[PDB]
Amino acid sequence: MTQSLFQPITLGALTLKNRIVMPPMTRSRASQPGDVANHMMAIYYAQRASAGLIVSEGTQISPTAKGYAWTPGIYTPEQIAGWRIVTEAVHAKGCAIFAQLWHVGRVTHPDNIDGQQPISSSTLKAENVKVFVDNGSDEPGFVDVAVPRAMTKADIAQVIADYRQAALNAMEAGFDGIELHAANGYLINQFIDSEANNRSDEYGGSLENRLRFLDEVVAALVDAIGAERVGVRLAPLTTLNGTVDADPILTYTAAAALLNKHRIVYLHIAEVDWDDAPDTPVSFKRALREAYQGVLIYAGRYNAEKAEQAINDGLADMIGFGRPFIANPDLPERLRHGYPLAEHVPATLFGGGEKGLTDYPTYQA
Template sequence: MPSLFDPIQLGAIHAANRVWMSPLTRGRSTRGHVPTPIMADYYRQRASAGLIITEATGISQQGLGWAYAPGIWSEEQVEAWKPITAAVHEAGGRIVSQLWHMGRLVHSDFLGGEPPVSSSATTAPGEVRTYPAEDSGEIKRPYTQARPLRTDEIPGILADYERAAQNAIRAGFDGVQIHAANGYLIDQFLRDNANFREDEYGGSIENRIRLLREVSQRVVDTIGADRTGVRLSPNGEVQGVNDSNPAPLFEAAAAALDEIGVAFLEMREPRPGGSRGEPDQPPIHPVMRKVYRGVLALNSDYDAESAQAALDAGEADAIAFGRTFLANPDLPRRLRDRLPLNPQREELFYVGGAEGYTDYPTADEAALQPA
């Protein structure tokens, strides 16, 4: 069986190893969602990943409701991404853009007071960070109720994904990943506690995976299946989204993606003892593995031993690391040489600036020795 440090081909993308960097929102863009120069340093530092999947990146203003997160719908954003992708490539890395529509998780503050859109008229639980008003320092507000997308609005959503995929290639990305996980728009269509539609996008599993299928097909038709990946989260409740019978749902979703031919599927599925608590259901990725024949990456609280064990068991072809990669820019080397890991500074995850972003030392800078 392959090791974590063996190369792998995913469509048109050659990854030097199977230690991937999973998408991690960091909030270092401008208020207008334009990437900033410091992001080139951040991604360059992590170019030893077999594949970098960028932080979630908005396909439109309608779909982006995270303060200081980047977008890829405007020419200014495309131009700002170019030095970032160039920096990664100059360092020998590969990088894809994660395309994001947040659906009901976009607060109306980001939309000029208009309601967000979703599969149905629902409201996400909890609060969201928004930009402070001029007369207030408050930046967290309860989510607002979404309105259902009309059927005649779906073509516009598909067009936004098409434009974003085209823009990603123009910006120098090696490909894209469609974010269909974690309770965002496509996931809101997939799962039955958020989708109460009675048209062709609701009800049966085949109807609920329709938007995922159409988005994936549009992106594949735009930039090629060999440069397209998808993220799913076959887990329990996430951001208020859940499903009463997830195994057949995600099996059908994986089979649809296999039929379309997307090059890779990366999944966030909690594992026992993980950072998000104990899973409330058995793992679903084994049944998905049976129907999806492309490159499969798993992601959730893996270390070197458990990651290699997943490859040895044939459960996955690669493993994506999240917060571990955030704090360790040279993570593949640390895993290979069994070097100690930097601690994560959670209080600095989203605050902006270099601290807790580009100042994590490499093993050489810290003069580390094997444990």
């Protein structure tokens, strides 16, 4: 009945109001030119501040880390300032907010990264994957991804430096912490999953090698802003964006244990990606619960009953609700009272302005 869902929880040096998380959700509303977070985004997040924790939509750490049109960056002074408007608005409402540091790797198109070729662990193209670009109109233009080039040792050092600085930038922008996007087939995931990584150097070939990039990026993030302000997102079983691992139970239980050693403040599991909702064995969830002992967050087709059950069964500490939060700014209140939930409009998920972003009303009987 959601009693545990409405219990507070400590997240590092922060105390959160409840166990509900607004998971990271790209809305591609950043101001142009410059991909700058803005007023409408600040209103959007502030409207949803009754969440215990808000994780921002993916925000690219550099010009070549972007995969979709109009997503907000976190590497220029104006971008940091734009995010500051957002964090000030959210904090005024009393809520913690983490910035999801993003590098899409091979999941992009040259049009989104200044005509450059995408980078990845290897030269493997993401099969049957599309992103969208700006095509001289305010409507997302979907295109097939491009074949990436394999990252060199120099590229690795550069990306780690970009992640490190992005974390500092997030703190300068007023965020309470950062979430490393190492899920949903993006750059780090392209190193983790065996079938997306055919490197013959120390970053591929063995489980230890496949987790090396994650290890080094997290080490840098923790060094920059503290483990209490670093969360990481993983996608053990979904494969929608083209990353598949041969032995995910081993790979991800190991990853969870590795992240536990870093003492990151939370581990966020993306259990469903759109309609890719693979069976995720309770036995596996319990193994993750032992491998990682910080705050464990799950997101993916949860409703009030399943969320409460997951917490009461000792599988999760917090639960994220994505699509429902898009259409219900007061999702927590609705879940607590059992008020009916509005449904979101797919057509307005990406691009455009306030319509389909800030005009979903709060519940009114």
